Symmetry: C2
Subunit: 313 residues, 2 copies
Amino acid sequence: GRLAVIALGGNAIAGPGMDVSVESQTAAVKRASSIIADVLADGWRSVITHGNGPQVGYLSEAFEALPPERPRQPLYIATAMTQAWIGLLLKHSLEEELRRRGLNVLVPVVISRVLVDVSDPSFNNPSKPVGPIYGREEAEELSRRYGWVFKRDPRGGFRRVVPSPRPVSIVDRDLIAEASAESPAVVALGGGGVPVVERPGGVLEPVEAVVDKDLASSLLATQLNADLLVILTDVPGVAVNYGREGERWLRRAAASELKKYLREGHFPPGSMGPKVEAAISFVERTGKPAVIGSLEEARQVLSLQAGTVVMLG
Amino acid sequence: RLAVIALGGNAIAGPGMDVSVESQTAAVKRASSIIADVLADGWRSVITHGNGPQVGYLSEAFEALPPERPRQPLYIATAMTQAWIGLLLKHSLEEELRRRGLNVLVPVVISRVLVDVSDPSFNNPSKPVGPIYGREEAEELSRRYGWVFKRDPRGGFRRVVPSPRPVSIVDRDLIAEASAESPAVVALGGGGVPVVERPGGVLEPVEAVVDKDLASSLLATQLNADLLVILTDVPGVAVNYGREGERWLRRAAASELKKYLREGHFPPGSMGPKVEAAISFVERTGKPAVIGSLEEARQVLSLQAGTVVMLG
């Protein structure tokens, strides 16, 4: 009855090509739920997290497609929306699967906020694109009016970029822990969580930014005193010389060794880098192993028999 | 004591369906301050709310994209409003409780409600949802999606969807568990995400909305709550609009309200459902139900304001 925080990736929620159509997602989630059911069968208790890239982007585009006079919801509200959207899909599918196996349990979806620091370098150097392509005139206006920041897209137009600060604490950790005590499967920290900052006087205030789901999941695992941090992606694990000549997939590696590779740019900042950073952080802060593997091989990954096991030292 | 408190539109958005974050944050702060007073007074609570303006806004946005872009189903939009409105309520309530000395977290429960596919409403939809469309746009949407529309006095067209009666709250147990851990729980947003039972145990989401008051009354009965509270804009139920007499009923036997209801005194688009919900709670549990104003919530919870419905 050990506890594992399992961080799902895009392949568990959306179809090939980033399709957020209800059809595509329901099929992907069915596959992911079946596999998660296997893991629960092996005796694990879990807190399942997930990303929300295509989904939050879709919502951003939708609100921006409205007539100029209509209000656009802020990014943190869009993020909250994705927690219910993706969360419900996983919740409904997993419950159905467990039921089909004779297990009658309800899967809660915890609306989750993540505390970030206002001093984080990302707030002054936003680089995460979110939403549709903006025209020059509209973008310059948004910058003048709301202080939005943009990056030029080589194919034409501009992309709004927002901060991606590092997670400091999981505000709703206690609700997640309580949910876990009551159910073997809990969905939380969707999209990396809703970012808030502490204002003077103890007041928490939501901010327009995104938080890396892997870094956040690692922090959650540490704060829950989880027995294991699992990152499920679309590759067998971590590899050095990935997609290159001397490519080699690691089966086990000391966090200290991976940290060296990380500092040399061996892991793309847009994919495996954050996952390796997350795994290392978990090992350093808890002293317990973390594993990065394929969603397909999840059952074995959890047993540490597949994927890359990041070890202490 | 456990009270199920059904919040209305004035608690979440601004007049004229103003769903901007500024207007909703302000509205929610006002409602949360009042709810915090209720909790400080000793009550434990499951707080529900509607989502009319919010779910309508989502539909409007999804349809604003080029026709080929994926459109999310109504059940997903409803779920989205639960996190949207839920987050706002949760955030502000926690802040208000903290200032009053209660350092607690407020959970938001994603909630589904079971309905029956044979419900008469499915083939005779009458619940208006979404933005107001023009005649040409509407007929085009009917050909494109098979949607049904209702024309208003001003010539505007609004989509109408089924609003079947709630049968059971699928996530009742999660709501009960949350309530055991926290004095304030937000659940059943918008009346709940509707689903129907199919071959086996399978639950199938359906295109429809459920009345939030009827669903709240059902939840209150299934949680064995001590009180069902419906907070709205009016001080209570009105049956007399003449210069003389009491303005709003202070208390009334279930059978008395039922008679007024059967006479047409309460429009199905407004007070009708609230009265039906209060009557149902009283008949099923024998405990009192009250319909009052959000402003006077503190007196309402105590049954010293609003219309108190009693068994009889």
